[PDB]
């Protein structure tokens, strides 16, 4: 679970198959797989639930490295297949969380931010960080030179 | 005018501080280190 919730650690759901299915398998308590997945029209929307947890928390570890990438990529990641794809496409853009921006041109979307919206923000971001990180430079090479020149 | 009359005051050739009042002053009133601004565009945005 805890592990499931930083980075998600993309992992065979068939092993999430025995992890939170052998609970059945216990020769102790079983009153939490009882309360949790042992429902039926609730667990099994549980199991589905954590479906949709696969889907939304690793569109969410997975929008990183978009602006580029196909449909079939995303099928071979998300570990599922390209309509279960447009049905999760589906509810996560109803969802809207973070603005999607799909297209069949040729395919090549993705959920995404709103597209490097900006003009001179790159000036700024880019040459702005870098050349204000290079004027603390100097004013710290002055603290590494004095500190090394004490001595030799 | 009655019971006073004035002094005369100059001030003094203070290049032994006048120096480096003066380098102090323009070494440091420009940007410190002077690398600090070489804010630049949103400001030029508000002020067109």
């Known amino acids: 679970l805890l592990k499931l919730f930083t980075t998600m650690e993309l992992m065979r759901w068939s092993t999430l198959v025995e992890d939170y299915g052998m609970e059945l398998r216990k020769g102790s308590l079983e009153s939490p797989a009882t309360d949790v997945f042992g429902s039926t029209e609730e667990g099994e929307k549980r199991w589905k639930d954590l479906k949709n947890r696969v889907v939304e928390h690793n569109i969410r570890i997975m929008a990183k490295y978009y602006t580029r990438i196909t449909m079939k990529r995303m099928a071979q990641l998300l570990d599922l297949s390209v309509d279960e794809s447009e049905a999760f496409l589906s509810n996560l853009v109803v969802n809207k969380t973070i603005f999607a921006k799909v297209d069949r041109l040729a395919g090549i979307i993705n959920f995404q931010r709103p597209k490097d919206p900006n003009n001179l923000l790159n000036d700024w971001s880019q040459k702005l960080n870098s050349l204000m990180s290079l004027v603390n430079k100097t004013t710290h090479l002055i603290a590494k030179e004095e500190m090394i020149h004490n001595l030799q | ?48």
């Open chain 2, 1 to 48: 005018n009655r019971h006073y009359y004035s002094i005369t005051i100059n001030y003094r050739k203070n290049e032994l501080e006048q120096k480096m009042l003066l380098n102090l002053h323009k070494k440091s009133w420009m940007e410190g280190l002077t690398l600090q601004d070489y804010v630049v565009k949103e400001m030029l945005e508000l002020a067109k």
